[PDB]
Amino acid sequence: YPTKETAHWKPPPWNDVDPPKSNLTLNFGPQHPAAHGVLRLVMELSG
Amino acid sequence: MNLMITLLTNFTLATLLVTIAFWLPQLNVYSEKTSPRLPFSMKFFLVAITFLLFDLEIALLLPLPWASQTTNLNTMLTMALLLIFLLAVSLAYEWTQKGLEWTE
Amino acid sequence: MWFEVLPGIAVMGVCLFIPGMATARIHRFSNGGREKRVAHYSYQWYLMERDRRVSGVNRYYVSKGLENID
Amino acid sequence: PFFDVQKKLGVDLDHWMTIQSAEQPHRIPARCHAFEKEWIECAHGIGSIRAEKECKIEFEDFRECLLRQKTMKRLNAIKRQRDKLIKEGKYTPPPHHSGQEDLRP
Amino acid sequence: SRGEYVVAKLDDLINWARRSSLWPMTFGLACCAVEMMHMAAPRYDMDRFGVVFRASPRQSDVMIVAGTLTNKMAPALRKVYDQMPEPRYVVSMGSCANGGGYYHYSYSVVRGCDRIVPVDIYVPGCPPTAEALLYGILQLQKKIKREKRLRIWYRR
Amino acid sequence: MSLVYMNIMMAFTVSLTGLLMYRSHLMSSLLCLEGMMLSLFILATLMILNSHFTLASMMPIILLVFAACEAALGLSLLVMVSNTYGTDYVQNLNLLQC
Amino acid sequence: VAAFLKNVWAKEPVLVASFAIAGLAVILPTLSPYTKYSLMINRATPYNYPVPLRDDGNMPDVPSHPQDPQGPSLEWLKRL
Amino acid sequence: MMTYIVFILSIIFVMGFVGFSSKPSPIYGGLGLIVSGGVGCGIVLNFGGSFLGLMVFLIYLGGMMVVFGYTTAMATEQYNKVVLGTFITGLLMEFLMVYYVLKDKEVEIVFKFNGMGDWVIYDTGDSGFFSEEAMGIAALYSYGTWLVIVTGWSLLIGVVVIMEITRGN
Amino acid sequence: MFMINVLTLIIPILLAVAFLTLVERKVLGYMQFRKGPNVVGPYGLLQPIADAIKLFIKEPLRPATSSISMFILAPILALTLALTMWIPLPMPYPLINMNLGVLFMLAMSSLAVYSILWSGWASNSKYALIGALRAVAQTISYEVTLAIILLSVLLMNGSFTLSTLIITQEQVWLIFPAWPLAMMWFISTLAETNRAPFDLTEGESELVSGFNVEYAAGPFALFFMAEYANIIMMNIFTTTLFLGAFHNPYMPELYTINFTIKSLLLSITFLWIRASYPRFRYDQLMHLLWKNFLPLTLALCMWHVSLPILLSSIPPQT
Ligand SMILES: CCCCCCCCCCCCCCCCCC(=O)OC[C@H](COP(=O)([O-])OCC[N+](C)(C)C)OC(=O)CCCCCCCCCCCCCCCCC
Numbered sequence A: 001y002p003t004k005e006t007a008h009w010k011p012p013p014w015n016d017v018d019p020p021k022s023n024l025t026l027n028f029g030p031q032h033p034a035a036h037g038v039l040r041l042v043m044e045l046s047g
Numbered sequence B: 001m002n003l004m005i006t007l008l009t010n011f012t013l014a015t016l017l018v019t020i021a022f023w024l025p026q027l028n029v030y031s032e033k034t035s036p037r038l039p040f041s042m043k044f045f046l047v048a049i050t051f052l053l054f055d056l057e058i059a060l061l062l063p064l065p066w067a068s069q070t071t072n073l074n075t076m077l078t079m080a081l082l083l084i085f086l087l088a089v090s091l092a093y094e095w096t097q098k099g100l101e102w103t104e
Numbered sequence C: 001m002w003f004e005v006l007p008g009i010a011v012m013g014v015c016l017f018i019p020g021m022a023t024a025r026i027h028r029f030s031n032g033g034r035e036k037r038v039a040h041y042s043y044q045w046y047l048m049e050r051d052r053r054v055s056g057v058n059r060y061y062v063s064k065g066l067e068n069i070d
Numbered sequence D: 001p002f003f004d005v006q007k008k009l010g011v012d013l014d015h016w017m018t019i020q021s022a023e024q025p026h027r028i029p030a031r032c033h034a035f036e037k038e039w040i041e042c043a044h045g046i047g048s049i050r051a052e053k054e055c056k057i058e059f060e061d062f063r064e065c066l067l068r069q070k071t072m073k074r075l076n077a078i079k080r081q082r083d084k085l086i087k088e089g090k091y092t093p094p095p096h097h098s099g100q101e102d103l104r105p
Numbered sequence E: 001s002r003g004e005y006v007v008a009k010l011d012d013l014i015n016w017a018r019r020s021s022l023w024p025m026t027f028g029l030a031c032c033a034v035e036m037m038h039m040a041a042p043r044y045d046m047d048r049f050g051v052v053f054r055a056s057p058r059q060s061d062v063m064i065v066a067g068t069l070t071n072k073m074a075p076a077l078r079k080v081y082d083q084m085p086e087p088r089y090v091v092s093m094g095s096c097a098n099g100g101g102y103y104h105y106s107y108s109v110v111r112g113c114d115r116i117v118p119v120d121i122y123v124p125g126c127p128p129t130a131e132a133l134l135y136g137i138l139q140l141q142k143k144i145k146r147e148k149r150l151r152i153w154y155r156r
Numbered sequence F: 001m002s003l004v005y006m007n008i009m010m011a012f013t014v015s016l017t018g019l020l021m022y023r024s025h026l027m028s029s030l031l032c033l034e035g036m037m038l039s040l041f042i043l044a045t046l047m048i049l050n051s052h053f054t055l056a057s058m059m060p061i062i063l064l065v066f067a068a069c070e071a072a073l074g075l076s077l078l079v080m081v082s083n084t085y086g087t088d089y090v091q092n093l094n095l096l097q098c
Numbered sequence G: 001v002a003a004f005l006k007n008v009w010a011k012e013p014v015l016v017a018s019f020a021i022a023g024l025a026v027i028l029p030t031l032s033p034y035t036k037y038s039l040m041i042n043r044a045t046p047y048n049y050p051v052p053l054r055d056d057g058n059m060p061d062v063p064s065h066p067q068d069p070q071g072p073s074l075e076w077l078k079r080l
Numbered sequence H: 001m002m003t004y005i006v007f008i009l010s011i012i013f014v015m016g017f018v019g020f021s022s023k024p025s026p027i028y029g030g031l032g033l034i035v036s037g038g039v040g041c042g043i044v045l046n047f048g049g050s051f052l053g054l055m056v057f058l059i060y061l062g063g064m065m066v067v068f069g070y071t072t073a074m075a076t077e078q079y080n081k082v083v084l085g086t087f088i089t090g091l092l093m094e095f096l097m098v099y100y101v102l103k104d105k106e107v108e109i110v111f112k113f114n115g116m117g118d119w120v121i122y123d124t125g126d127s128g129f130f131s132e133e134a135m136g137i138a139a140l141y142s143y144g145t146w147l148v149i150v151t152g153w154s155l156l157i158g159v160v161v162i163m164e165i166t167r168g169n
Numbered sequence I: 001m002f003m004i005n006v007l008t009l010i011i012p013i014l015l016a017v018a019f020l021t022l023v024e025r026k027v028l029g030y031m032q033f034r035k036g037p038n039v040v041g042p043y044g045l046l047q048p049i050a051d052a053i054k055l056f057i058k059e060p061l062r063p064a065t066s067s068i069s070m071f072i073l074a075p076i077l078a079l080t081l082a083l084t085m086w087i088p089l090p091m092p093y094p095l096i097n098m099n100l101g102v103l104f105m106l107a108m109s110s111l112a113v114y115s116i117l118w119s120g121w122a123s124n125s126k127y128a129l130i131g132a133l134r135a136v137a138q139t140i141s142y143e144v145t146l147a148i149i150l151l152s153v154l155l156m157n158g159s160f161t162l163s164t165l166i167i168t169q170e171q172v173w174l175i176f177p178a179w180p181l182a183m184m185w186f187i188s189t190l191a192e193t194n195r196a197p198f199d200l201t202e203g204e205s206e207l208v209s210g211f212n213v214e215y216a217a218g219p220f221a222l223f224f225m226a227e228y229a230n231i232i233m234m235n236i237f238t239t240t241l242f243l244g245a246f247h248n249p250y251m252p253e254l255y256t257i258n259f260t261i262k263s264l265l266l267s268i269t270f271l272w273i274r275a276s277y278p279r280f281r282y283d284q285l286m287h288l289l290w291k292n293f294l295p296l297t298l299a300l301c302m303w304h305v306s307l308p309i310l311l312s313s314i315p316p317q318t
């Protein structure tokens, strides 16, 4: 029975599966800049 | 009572050290400086849950030095080896189903 | 040479020696020249409170021997 | 669906933690062991309906052992009347209720 | 009087503490990194002066600029300098950090790091020896020793 | 009855009405659930120590172990919800109205 | 079984020591002659009070004094 | 005052529960539940549950609330009216209950409650050379055989269940 | 009189933590073929004083914090737990003689990860929080083997009482019946205090210790001195636990000298391990816990349960 409140309701998907609806980027540098110190690394980490 | 006095004294000395370490370097007026979700990992949460469940198994294991004093020693030894074996079986299922991977 | 580290180790060793020696001397000063009574179990506390009541001075460490009976 | 498997097989899975009057480690008595033993040995075998109206005195003594409501209410009455008589000045406390009498043992 | 004496002895205490516990951040940009690493090597050994090797850049006292500052790393230099807690000092090590050096006329080199940060000690060389850098560190300590922060505070 | 039992039961009801009135976060709901467990732990422990009922001294430990494993299950549910929707909000869990 | 044992002792000796120590801990108390004495010592440790018996007239094994001959003895524990 | 120590710790306990249950954020709610667990542990310790209070610290605060703060740190973001209003609401309800049960030595919310210090209800005897609480917990291995079986089975199943539902497949 | 005893515990703790920095820099100096500090004091003895006065008048760094309250409470909790871990330590007499001192220390050390967690929350950087969660997962991982090794050793002690553990070791050091427990204990306490080769926050294998990152952090001296109080305390606890000394009840100073010398040697062993090895990768010390230490710890736990039963050597409760 359609009402004003239950008006926007669509039926669920047929397989009852909904759409799902990234990875880290690190701008890296050497810890103590004694040895290298002049390195820049743009990482793309996945954890 | 003496425990509460000692806890209050340790808390007081710690708070005094923290209050000094925040307010003593504010004595020297400095040049006021005017220039100018996190990614989820499943393994980080899984190592914490594995910790929690093995810690509950440890909570079962903690009354053993009192449990050896019993007169029902055969039952006690059976259940003691059984709890340590179930902890080992939890570890083996955590092993073999790729649960301890990339934080091994 | 390597014996130059021994003044710092000696100062740190004196600083670790102070707490234990301190608590032993304070336990002997607060308890009539003897060890502090250890009451982990309620029987030990019962005997200790009985000592406090029989000593007459509200102090468990005042020991009453055979001079207290007739 | 109380499938009484324990009484059927003779196993004791949880009857040991069930009451306070059971076998305890190192024979430690519960603080209301006698009251619970009296209420259980009263109410045994006669069912709940007869047990609520025929073993009422044993259960009341046992509930008042557990909760100590009548004891604390009685001490409240005595302590309030004592404090009223102290405030009115019509009562003095004895030396053995002030720490002045070198206790018994 | 009495207050001048008290602020003089307190200057002596805090200057002693700050010079005798220098924690260096090193911009090891170029060849002078190798010679600072020799100044921390067991012969010269900065750590016996209180000058710890590989200190944290977040809690460092002196920024040792040891190498060629290029135009591409000048804002990173200034950013690390701006993240330093005061009192912060800067030792400029070597000719390229002092004045451009061998790359003075380059299109891509900052002609001395003093165009970017204030410099306290200029240590000359290509590279200056590890002994010469330790000389510059001890001259920085002498410069801290004659500071008058509380005496000038008292006289204002 | 005793005066501390009032406060421990009132703590249970405070964490109950916290758990029965969500704001946004499912984590705060789980915090209220384990506060309910904490108040139950303290209340059972005070009864069992007061009664000198010896064998039920192992009861609050079994309560703690089972309900902390329950809490681990709930945190894993929250983690799967957070990996679905990005947050742990209970207003994102509304697909089952239709 | 000798090839597998040397192979797992070459590849995973921590697990071999683990299963060996665990297997000894399982099967060893049933083979030890002193496992009896653990039970004997735990049941001989007097936590409670030895609540005495009313002498009805026929209890020949129960002593009348602690230093009497009859009764349970711990000479096996003094000697071992 | 000092005879009311368990009562004062229980008041701090209820204040901490009104604190986190009003739900400012799961971070501060976790902090309030930590302080509440500590003071409720002190309540347990002042009856002679020394092992059970150390079980609170070691297990509850030590493992489980650490895992709650850990999982909160992975699910909240680091940088109201209703929280502070419900906080002072619960605080006023609790202090009105305190005031009634103190001025009257009696109250009835759901049950009747004494107003004296809960020192009154203790035992006047000893336990000898053991703790009764320690021996009752030690009997988990000689008397709680079925209890150990079902607890260990639930924990093993719990490990299996967490590895199932966090797998995503 | 009791407050005198509390202060003569806790103030020499801070002085020993001060001079442990000197002992560390010197002993790491001579092992690295150089000297440690010898300029600031005679033989370097004024280096902790100068360094502490320097750290206490240094500016709060640059940035602001996400949560003021946890930024304050994390050093308070760290120092409070680092000071309360010392009060049941029997040396030969504990300050607070409790029946459950072992379980007290295990619980208060389990509470120590909240300082790391709240300092990760209180920083503004979302990368420092990730580093804090890695550190929390490390510390809670090695607390498992701390608990089980500690339980396995206490099965020969009879109780959780720390003062009984002097009586237990009157005939032999307890490292002789339990040396695999002792070495996994020592390495697990090493991995507890974030100490090299397990120091991933203070080193590399870290997403945030990477030179010109954000993250307002606390005053470094407080967490540092809490950490060194924990290092000296865990070495004293290992000394009590496995290398317990002779105690004459009429001469307590003999036990105090003996456990002090052993605790100094064991803290220098921490210093000598950190100057000898490279660092683990994070999953390598997760491997070392979960796949290496925990199987042997469970196996030796079964062994130390069943072993006093089969040898008729069950220790007394009292
Ligand atoms: C208390 C005072 C101090 C105590 C001693 C400690 C001082 C010495 C410290 C040295 C420096 C250590 C720095 C950190 C090192 C960390 C790395 C490391 O060692 O990893 C451990 C390594 C890890 O393994 P791994 O990484 O080297 O090897 C590869 C591992 N797999 C195959 C999984 C990839 O070994 C262990 O885990 C051993 C732990 C202790 C072993 C105890 C042995 C017991 C033996 C019983 C008998 C066995 C015989 C068979 C059965 C017989 C039955 C009758």
Ligand SMILES: CCCCCCCCCCCCCCCCCC(=O)OC[C@H](COP(=O)(O)OCCN)OC(=O)CCCCCCCCCCCCCCCCC
Binding pocket: E005, E006, E009, E010, E012, E013, E016, E145, I018, I039, I040, I046, I048, I049, I052, I053
């Ligand atoms: C009313 C009167 C009081 C007024 C207020 C003052 C209070 C007292 C403050 C301390 C004393 C003030 C003077 C401080 C030192 C001044 C003199 C000085 O710097 O002498 C230099 C000398 C070493 O010479 P140097 O220049 O280093 O040469 C290199 C080696 N050839 O240096 C040395 O030989 C060593 C100098 C050591 C400094 C003193 C010792 C340290 C401070 C101890 C007290 C404060 C800290 C207490 C503990 C804090 C926590 C650990």
Ligand SMILES: CCCCCCCCCCCCCCCCCC(=O)OC[C@H](COP(=O)(O)OCCN)OC(=O)CCCCCCCCCCCCCCCCC
Binding pocket: B085, B088, B089, B091, B092, B095, B096, G008, G012, G015, G016, G017, G018, G019, G020, G022, G023, G026, I295, I296, I298, I299
């Ligand atoms: C019976 C007494 C009670 C026994 C139960 C109690 C055990 C206590 C110890 C707890 C151990 C917990 C973890 C167990 C996990 C077992 C599964 C496993 O580890 O398999 C993987 C392993 C290969 O390792 P991998 O996956 O490659 O590791 C990464 C690095 N390469 O695979 C292997 O290395 C092979 C593992 C299986 C074979 C091991 C044989 C050891 C034999 C020792 C002597 C006999 C001892 C008695 C027990 C019977 C053993 C057959």
Ligand SMILES: CCCCCCCCCCCCCCCCCC(=O)OC[C@H](COP(=O)(O)OCCN)OC(=O)CCCCCCCCCCCCCCCCC
Binding pocket: C011, C014, C015, I015, I041, I042, I045, I046, I049
């Ligand atoms: C449990 C044990 C704990 C032990 C903790 C302490 C360990 C180290 C012990 C001290 C070792 C020796 C320290 C010597 C420091 C330097 C003294 C000195 O003379 O410094 C020179 C400086 C300037 O003197 P000036 O007048 O310029 O001389 C020119 C001469 N024509 O003169 C000055 O700066 C003025 C004088 C400063 C003297 C400072 C002495 C050290 C103070 C340290 C603080 C703690 C004191 C001990 C507290 C605990 C024990 C009671």
Ligand SMILES: CCCCCCCCCCCCCCCCCC(=O)OC[C@H](COP(=O)(O)OCCN)OC(=O)CCCCCCCCCCCCCCCCC
Binding pocket: B001, B003, B004, B007, B011, C039, C040, C041, H034, H035, H036, H037, H038, H039, H041, H042, H043, H045, H046, H050, H051, H053, H054, I073, I076, I077, I080, I081, I084, I097, I098, I099, I100, I101, I104
């Ligand atoms: C962020 C907030 C601030 C953070 C910094 C400060 C808080 C954290 C650090 C403090 C932690 C306190 C832990 C104190 C309890 C430890 C357990 C305990 O009491 O053990 C000692 C002892 C047990 O041994 P036993 O011999 O069996 O008992 C005596 C009978 N003969 O038992 C006794 O001796 C019993 C003595 C009486 C009971 C003591 C109760 C203490 C007060 C209540 C808890 C206080 C802490 C609350 C907050 C915790 C952290 C949030």
Ligand SMILES: CCCCCCCCCCC1=C(C)C(=O)C(OC)=C(OC)C1=O
Binding pocket: E023, E052, E054, E055, E056, I017, I018, I021, I024, I025, I048, I051, I052, I055, I202, I221, I224, I225
């Ligand atoms: C209350 C006493 C405070 C003393 C403070 C001493 C701090 C340590 C100085 C040297 C040092 C060591 C050993 C150190 O290990 C370390 O971490 C890598 C530092 O930070 C960069 C250090 O600066």
Ligand code: SF4
Binding pocket: E030, E031, E032, E033, E066, E067, E068, E093, E094, E095, E096, E097, E101, E102, E125, E126, E127, E128
């Ligand atoms: S001043 Fe010279 S030697 Fe030094 S870093 Fe520059 S180019 Fe290299």
